[PDB]
Design a protein around this ligand. Sequence first.
Ligand code: HEM
Ligand code: HEM
Lengths: 248, 248
Amino acid sequence: GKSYPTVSADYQKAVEKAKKKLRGFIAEKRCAPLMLALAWHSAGTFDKGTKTGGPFGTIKHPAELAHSANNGLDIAVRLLEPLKAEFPILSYADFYQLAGVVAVEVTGGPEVPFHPGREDKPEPPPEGRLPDATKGSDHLRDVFGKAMGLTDQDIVALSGGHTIGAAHKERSGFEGPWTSNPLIFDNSYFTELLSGEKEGLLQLPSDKALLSDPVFRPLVDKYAADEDAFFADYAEAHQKLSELGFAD
Amino acid sequence: GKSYPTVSADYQKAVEKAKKKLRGFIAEKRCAPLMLALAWHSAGTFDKGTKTGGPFGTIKHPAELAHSANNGLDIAVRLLEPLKAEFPILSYADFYQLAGVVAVEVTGGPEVPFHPGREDKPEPPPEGRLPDATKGSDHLRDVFGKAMGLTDQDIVALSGGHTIGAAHKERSGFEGPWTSNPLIFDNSYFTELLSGEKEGLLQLPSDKALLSDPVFRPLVDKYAADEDAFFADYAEAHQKLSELGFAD
Ligand code: HEM
Ligand code: HEM
């Protein structure tokens, strides 16, 4: 259902050059997880029914940065600002989504297709649209399904985004990585989720909710058995996520 | 631009009976001002661009009651609940708007036309849409004009709603009545606004903003000179306000 806009040849060239600079920067700084969190929090506020929120550059706003959910994303914005200044032709909207695609690529994940053209919009969405780690399967469906408009398959595959990074007790209050290799994008999140608790590793109630749901669980099983299948469904869901409200 | 829905004869009959019970109740309890505030806060969250908020019964929600702007409106809701229980066929949306129309009538104001049929909606709007007493003419136009979709004339006439009632230092922090007769609906708000400060009487910065605006000021002048003209424009604006997002 997407009709992507035309951007100038100079715009396309800056996308390709920023993509490369982003790989080197994100790899050296070890910030892929944070960058994937910035792209997701930017996109995941989309509400399909009113067409507000979504990946439109507004996360750099002090007001959206203020959102509790956005704990420490002010660091992400700060880290990218010097690099962004090198590409003044690109929208922040595009640049943040491109950082998210790069974060997944440089940690070894699938190549999520990217289309430029998102415009930077003046108003951040209301606070409170991002999911709550303490809630379960109904809440995930309200958030990904009723608000963003993603499928049940997308919810499980996108949860696998937790295969990189960690929680921090000074940010959310949860603490620690989901996997033994938190800078490597793989299907380990699902493997660890299934095998139960292990010292040093995190499972949120929202992650565990995938285990008891009649539709989520067979997807958890599929992805733990077949990383190629995880990667295919992940790239599909991330692409849709990064394009919410864009080019419809 | 309004196409009002059909309601059953029994619905219409309960409107007429609740109208009368509301006059006697609101007059005896001396709560017209609070009731007009409940109706306005219920309606004034309408955002035309997304069609959210507006007079749809959601102010009774603990979550909307929580809004700081709604300081003490939990009292209003409480006062009406026994009476509402006598009219289970009416929507809360209709009942609150009818209390607002009655509040204006029983204090001596114009007869604002009323049409039933508003449905009670499940989700309260986001917090922060109601105007801020410390801001000025640009802010009033953002709020009444860009969000609700009312005219410059409606802003000035609706501000005359402050001809009844008072601020309270434990609610907003402002304190006192705008007029010497705070249970009498008349053009005194504009008379007092013009004559400057007087001991015992309140003017918010938002009220004073009407004095310095090239479009608001001649309306202030007109209404201070001609109560009949105020009443005509007030009834027009209150009607539109009470119908935001309804029967379009
Ligand atoms: C299913 C609903 C989700 C919930 C309840 C949730 C909750 C959380 C929480 C509480 C944290 C810890 C923040 C901190 O303390 O630093 C976190 C981190 C993270 N989230 Fe999720 N999240 C969800 C979905 C997603 C999605 C869809 C993605 C991306 C595809 C994602 C990517 C990440 C990443 C990469 C981190 C680590 C950030 C870092 O290392 O600093 N999450 N999430
Ligand atoms: C122009 C923007 C407005 C601002 C900034 C504003 C602000 C305020 C504030 C700060 C209070 C005091 C609340 C308290 O401390 O108890 C108040 C009271 C009140 N407002 Fe306004 N208001 C505005 C517009 C309106 C409108 C459009 C109406 C209805 C037509 C209205 C009706 C009232 C009434 C009747 C009271 C007295 C409530 C009572 O006596 O308890 N106001 N307003």
